[PDB]
Amino acid sequence: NETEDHLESLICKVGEKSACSLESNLEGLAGVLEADLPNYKSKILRLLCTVARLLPEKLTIYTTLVGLLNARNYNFGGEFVEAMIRQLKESLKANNYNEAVYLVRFLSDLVNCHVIAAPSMVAMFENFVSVTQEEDVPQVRRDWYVYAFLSSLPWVGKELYEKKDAEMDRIFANTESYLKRRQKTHVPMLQVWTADKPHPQEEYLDCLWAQIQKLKKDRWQERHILRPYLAFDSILCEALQHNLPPFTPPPHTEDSVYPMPRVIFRMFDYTDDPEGPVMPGSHSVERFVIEENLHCIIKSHWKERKTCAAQLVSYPGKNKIPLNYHIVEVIFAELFQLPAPPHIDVMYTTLLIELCKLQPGSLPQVLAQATEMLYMRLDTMNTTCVDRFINWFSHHLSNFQFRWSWEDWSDCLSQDPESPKPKFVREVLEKCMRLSYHQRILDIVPPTFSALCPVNPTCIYKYGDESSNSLPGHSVALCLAVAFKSKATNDEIFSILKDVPNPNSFNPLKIEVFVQTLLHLAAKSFSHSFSALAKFHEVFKTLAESDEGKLHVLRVMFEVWRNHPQMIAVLVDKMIRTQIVDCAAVANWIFSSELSRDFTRLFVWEILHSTIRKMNKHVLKIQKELEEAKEKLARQHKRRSDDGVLEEQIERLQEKVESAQSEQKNLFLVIFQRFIMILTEHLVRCETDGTSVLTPWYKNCIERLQQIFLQHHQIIQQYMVTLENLLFTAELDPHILAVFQQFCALQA
């Protein structure tokens, strides 16, 4: 164990900033490993493999190290190469592919260290590219194979071209032929910005191909990647080269899942920093290397924010670059990447806070500039990305005493109030109020912005003292109020609710009066509302037996609490959890006529996504319970064989999981049906009226449909068949069907 922990720490120490030059530490580490070679061969091989798989940002270093070991022990190099091939095959079979990319890159860089012969790796990359010639195969897998090839190229391209220029040219021709005839249907769904200026959000494969071509035009002369092995030009040159075995890629299987396509998040230019080192161009492989290294650094240390910030700040490079701008750009790319960020968003905001703390003289200005540029380009930003931006900016301001030069954004006052910029400002102020008190937000915005401030979060009771008595249900409301103040029981509340002149089993006036009084009396805190809802839960169940009752309860709750959207969301959450209203009722309420004015607000879609997440978590929980029961049944059966009620319980759990899956299917079907209905209604109205179809309402609605698809692709891949057969058909309007087609191409 001591030898194990020691060796691990030792192998993971190389790379960290040290007084001794990197070359000296590498040589010492190689010598130490060779010294203990004959007793820990397998351990050393496994440690090096896992380090190559889990620390891509340090790639070159470890690469060199292997070469140094190969420069002394040929057998070690051969065994290590075989282990790498085996690990890569395991990763491909394991359906994880980022590790496969990192291992392929490690192998590619091993060529520079004179560990692997160039011709063998040229053959391996030839097979990679020839995978694009397969028939009846998802485009995602061909895309990934070409991506692995082109991403390995920045590291071993010089050597491969110098050794096998003809075969490399043929491989490039095949890659160009493939890239010419690719499908770009998925791009608009994933682009953060639809605008072509000032920075197109080009597809990742197209961007990488452009950068590789620029590098090839530059005679493969790159100026960023560290190449420690160069310092050992002598030592590494006398080493004998190994030959890879003919590598055939694992055959496509129906169980195979491939990484989804991504769009490069470009938002900075060299002109944005006219004082620091020149920023590498968008179509320069240096930019890609920097972005990938920073993404890997974030992924490795995504848990601890302080360590991640320290590592990001101290990212080394052959030539100086504007590190602050690169860090901000990659962090925003992670936050805004679609379908979902690699990690949680609160992590990104806190990491930006920590980075600003680490570098308080430069980074805050870069963050302010980035925020201003993000605001300026709001006219075409994705609504999902707009929500993420709103949340991040609200949290940032909350962390910095809600200080900002709002006057710089004064241009949003003049234009339409529903437009992306004033809408973003309103939603940001609403979130800021959510993280503070209403009066605190009125004191920070300049008086000219008062129109965009949030409304006071106060309850609206229809049966107030000033309210007229003509409204039916005033006496009953007063009686219910006094009963509530008297610590009433459910039976006597039912008794008082007995006397209601039913306008029509389901009474709308009864539900209205009850819910209004209950919410008004518990309109001081969330705890009070929770206690009142739970205490009178039986009344809710009795009055909300039917779907109409649940919809009316939701409508009345919205009417009472419309200036306090956080209260709406919390109350809906509690009602769903308590089973007062199902998820279908909430989904129908979101598209109800009452919420047409608030349809484009962020809290509505937060509520919808929270309900979907609740359903997903419920299904997962019941599935986990069923799996645990089945596993314990198998364990008991095997133990008994080695030497009735449980089967009934298993069948009951199977029934419950089947019901939960059916409920999830119904929820998603209902949501898609309502989205289709609203969008087709708008499109028909625009066609008959001869007006423009691209309006803020349409943009928001279509982007929210896209948001549902993107967030819950993992669960909609199951319903794919019924979605294609019932909702999304040929007869559907092309505008709406485009979202479904893009979702289809996302993982196909």
């Binding site: 703390k357 805050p364 200080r403 030069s405 710089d408």
Partner: peptide
């Protein structure tokens, strides 16, 4: 562990922005 330095930096930055707009 007080980040008063960062707070002062942000305050000065926003003050400079406001002054530049005013001028």
């Amino acid at each position: 562990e007080d980040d008063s330095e960062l707070q002062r930096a942000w305050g000065a930055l926003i003050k400079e922005k406001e002054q530049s707009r005013q001028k």
